Write a structure and sequence with these properties.
Pathway: Sesquiterpene biosynthesis; trichothecene biosynthesis. This is Trichothecene 15-O-acetyltransferase TRI3. By secondary structure, this protein is of the alpha+beta class. It folds into 2 domains: about 240 residues, Chloramphenicol acetyltransferase-like domain (Chloramphenicol Acetyltransferase, 2-Layer Sandwich); about 260 residues, Nonribosomal peptide synthetase, condensation domain (Chloramphenicol Acetyltransferase), CATH 3.30.559.30. The chain is about 35% helix and about 20% strand. It contains 13 helices and 16 strands. A hairpin with a 4-residue loop joins strand 13 and strand 14. Helix 3 packs across helix 4. The longest helix is centred in the last third of the chain and has 23 residues. The protein is globular. The termini are far apart. The relative contact order is 0.18.
């Protein structure tokens, strides 16, 4: 297994002015950056936010003036976090190249921001537009997505129609996954919602010009150089643990699992929003039944497994799932909480003795609870083997480099069957505010009602995401519609939800 490598991934000035820098991407970046996949938007991130106009009656909003305010916000945000204007290129190597260049002029910067914000008077939701964009893609037939763009939608006649009191404005954020992980992208949405507050109800042309060039130092530093651990100190324990992961990875590609139909078509999504009341009861049941260190994310992973067992093989089968985790805790404290580029690593969930946890929905509640509890303890114990290790972020970078190379070499890496994968997105309040306010007055202007986070799926496994907003948990399953019917995914999602609900006290 090739080593890191830190020098290989640092920012480099590409010319005399210092205004353009580039770096070879690393780890999970290399996976989502694979040229043949990135050009087809195969891992693109979308965040669908539904907002409600709760502003004072004297605040006049239109799609046209919202676009103007978000252009201003996006410029401020580019200064704070220039990942939003990085671009991608490739040579003959597997890892993508990430470039950042300061705007050549304030005019050029303004042109760029205008180019990233779009509006439509329409009744379509943000997710309706995702569907349309993916259908349109696809039909249009090979250019990588921008780091970020926004689409503002509202059911009004024109872009100068005042948005009625309590009317919905939807925003779809669309990002090339190369330049962010889910955390960084949501943090950036939060930043835009903060920054746009400066421009509601005002002389923006007269405001202090941004000194372009000065934001280069605001790019997230290279992950390798940001670690607590000195990677030069690594040895055979590190190599063995990396090999344990890559062995699990390769075996997961080849393992028995959920049947799928071969092919490739469009990414699709099925969403189940649990009520706040249900979510609070589920979280309480986890705390009570299982205690500290256990979470609804563990329970969801447990329910995924029980739903899989109920849906379906060898006596000694082990459920093995190479998952990804946020790597920020492995970064130095003064970097870790302000990191917008990809910062992901890897763990392997393992659950043995599947027969002992095989329960139907018609079995006694106590049997189901006991099965879920067993699985949760297996899940948490698994994570412990990975998360307690100080080299884990370094391992992620190294093994994900390998994974990118594997996926380049094997474009159809699953055959016949693929087990569902769980991704926890966590609590959205960490990153995005409940309201957009007029900053000068503190007045609420737009209520952020719902947040749905989607990542395009071009591989044949069910990718199951959990997050939370306003104390309500949402489960989303993203799948490719060549591989499953919507009905079977819905059936599976409902099964997972039913087991989660069964855990309630």
């Amino acid at each position: 297994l090739p080593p890191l490598v830190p020098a290989l991934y640092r920012w480099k000035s590409t010319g005399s002015s210092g205004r353009q820098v580039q770096r070879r991407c690393v780890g999970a970046e290399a996976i989502v950056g694979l040229e043949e996949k990135n050009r087809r938007a195969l891992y693109d991130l979308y965040i669908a936010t539904s907002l409600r106009n709760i502003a004072p009656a004297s605040t006049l909003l239109t799609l046209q003036n919202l676009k103007e305010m978000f252009e201003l916000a996006l410029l401020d945000a580019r200064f704070e976090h220039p990942e939003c204007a990085c671009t991608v290129s490739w040579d003959d190597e597997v890892p993508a190249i990430i470039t950042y260049e300061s705007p050549e002029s304030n005019e050029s910067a303004r042109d760029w921001a205008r180019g990233c914000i779009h509006v439509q008077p329409t009744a379509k939701s943000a997710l309706d537009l995702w569907s349309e964009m993916e259908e349109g893609r696809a039909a249009a037939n090979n250019t990588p997505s921008k780091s970020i763009e926004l689409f503002l939608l509202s059911d009004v006649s024109t872009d100068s129609t005042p948005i009625p009191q309590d009317a919905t404005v939807e925003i779809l954020f669309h990002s090339n996954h190369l330049f962010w992980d889910g955390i960084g992208c949501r943090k950036f949405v939060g930043d835009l919602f903060r920054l746009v507050g400066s421009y509601i109800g005002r002389d923006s042309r007269e405001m202090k010009k941004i000194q372009w060039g000065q934001e280069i130092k605001n790019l997230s530093p290279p992950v390798v150089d940001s670690l607590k651990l000195d990677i030069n100190t690594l040895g055979s324990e590190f190599d063995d643990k990396c090999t344990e992961y890559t062995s699990a990875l390769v075996a997961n590609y080849k393992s028995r699992g959920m049947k799928f139909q071969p092919g490739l078509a469009l990414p699709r999504c099925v969403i189940h929003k649990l009520s706040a009341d249900e979510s609070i009861d589920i979280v309480k049941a986890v705390k009570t039944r299982l205690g500290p260190g256990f979470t609804i994310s563990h329970l969801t992973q447990a329910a995924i497994v029980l739903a899989l067992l109920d849906h379906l093989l060898s006596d000694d089968e082990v459920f093995i799932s190479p998952t990804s985790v946020d790597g920020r805790r492995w970064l130095r404290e003064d970097i870790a909480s302000n990191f917008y580029a990809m910062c992901q690593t890897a763990a392997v969930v393992r659950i043995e003795n599947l027969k002992s946890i095989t329960v139907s929905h018609k079995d006694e509640k106590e049997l189901q609870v006991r099965a879920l509890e067993s699985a949760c303890r297996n899940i948490k114990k698994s994570y412990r083997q990975w998360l307690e290790n100080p080299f884990l972020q370094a391992l992620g970078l190294r093994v994900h480099n390998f994974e990118a190379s594997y996926l380049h070499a094997k474009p159809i890496p699953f055959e016949g069957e693929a087990n569902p994968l769980f991704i926890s997105d966590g609590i959205n309040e960490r990153f995005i505010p409940h309201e957009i306010k007029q900053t000068a007055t503190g007045e609420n202007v737009l209520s952020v009602e719902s947040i749905d986070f989607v990542v395009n799926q071009s591989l044949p496994y069910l990718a199951i995401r959990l997050d939370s907003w306003r104390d309500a948990s949402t489960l989303n399953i993203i799948y490719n519609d060549a591989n499953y019917t919507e009905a079977e995914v819905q059936k599976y999602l409902q099964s997972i939800v039913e087991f989660m609900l069964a855990f309630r006290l």
